[PDB]
Design an enzyme around this catalytic site. Structure first.
Site, short mmCIF file in Angstrom:
data_model
loop_
_atom_site.label_atom_id
_atom_site.label_comp_id
_atom_site.label_asym_id
_atom_site.label_seq_id
_atom_site.Cartn_x
_atom_site.Cartn_y
_atom_site.Cartn_z
N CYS A 97 0.84 -1.19 0.00
CA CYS A 97 0.00 0.00 0.00
C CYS A 97 0.88 1.24 0.00
O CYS A 97 1.97 1.25 0.58
CB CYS A 97 -0.91 -0.02 1.23
SG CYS A 97 -2.00 1.39 1.51
N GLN A 115 -13.10 -1.10 3.99
CA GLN A 115 -13.71 -2.38 3.64
C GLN A 115 -14.10 -3.12 4.91
O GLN A 115 -13.40 -3.05 5.92
CB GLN A 115 -12.75 -3.23 2.80
CG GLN A 115 -12.40 -2.60 1.46
CD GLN A 115 -11.57 -3.53 0.60
OE1 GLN A 115 -10.39 -3.29 0.36
NE2 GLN A 115 -12.19 -4.60 0.13
N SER A 138 -8.46 -6.22 -1.15
CA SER A 138 -7.14 -5.70 -1.50
C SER A 138 -6.05 -6.73 -1.33
O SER A 138 -5.04 -6.67 -2.04
CB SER A 138 -6.79 -4.45 -0.68
OG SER A 138 -7.90 -3.59 -0.43
N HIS A 141 -3.91 -8.17 5.32
CA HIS A 141 -3.45 -7.05 6.15
C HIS A 141 -2.98 -7.53 7.52
O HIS A 141 -3.57 -8.44 8.11
CB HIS A 141 -4.58 -6.05 6.39
CG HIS A 141 -5.30 -5.60 5.15
ND1 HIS A 141 -4.99 -4.42 4.49
CD2 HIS A 141 -6.28 -6.19 4.42
CE1 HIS A 141 -5.78 -4.29 3.44
NE2 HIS A 141 -6.56 -5.36 3.36
#
Ligand SMILES: CN1CCN(c2cccc(N)c2)CC1
Length: 147
Positions: A97, A115, A138, A141
């Site tokens: 990111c 999200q 994405s 995380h």
């Protein structure tokens, strides 16, 4: 009575009880014990070939599989938890990111903006707590709640 999100579990390798959070994917040995308008978080994102945009500042074409991305995430979590490396250092070097340039900081946000799996994990974390692997469109995380 355990707080919501948390469940008791038993190791597997050692037989010792531990606690697991199915919203944050955090796990810990101690009993967890225990919402605001807004939270502040940092994150480290590892993308994979099925990410919504398989591209980042690190790589024009991201080709690693989701399984490979989860292995990378798990390795970063190990090094953060051992103290061998800092979250901020790993985010700056390896997050897919563009927030990598700010040590992973996303700033403050409210419900409705992120999200959903990311939002739910962020708001279930206590201040200073780190998530386990959290999956979104994405990628995968690691989330650190800073405020
Ligand atoms: C999706 N990303 C876009 C880039 N972002 C960013 C970039 C530089 C610095 C900070 N704090 C955040 C926000 C999250």
């Amino acid at each position: 009575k355990l707080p919501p999100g948390w469940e008791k579990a038993m190791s597997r390798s050692s037989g010792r009880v531990y606690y697991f959070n199915h919203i944050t994917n955090a796990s810990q040995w101690e009993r967890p014990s225990g919402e605001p308008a807004r939270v502040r978080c940092s994150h480290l994102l590892v993308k994979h070939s099925q990410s919504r945009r398989p591209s980042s500042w690190r790589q024009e074409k991201i080709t690693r599989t989701k399984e490979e991305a989860l292995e990378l995430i798990n390795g970063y979590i190990q090094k953060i938890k051992s103290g061998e490396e800092d979250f901020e250092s790993l985010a700056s070097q390896f997050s897919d990111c563009s927030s990598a340039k700010a040590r992973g900081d996303l700033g403050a946000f409210s419900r409705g903006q992120m999200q959903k799996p990311f939002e739910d994990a962020s708001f279930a974390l206590r201040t200073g707590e780190m998530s386990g692997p959290v999956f979104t469109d994405s990628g995968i995380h690691i989330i650190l709640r800073t405020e």
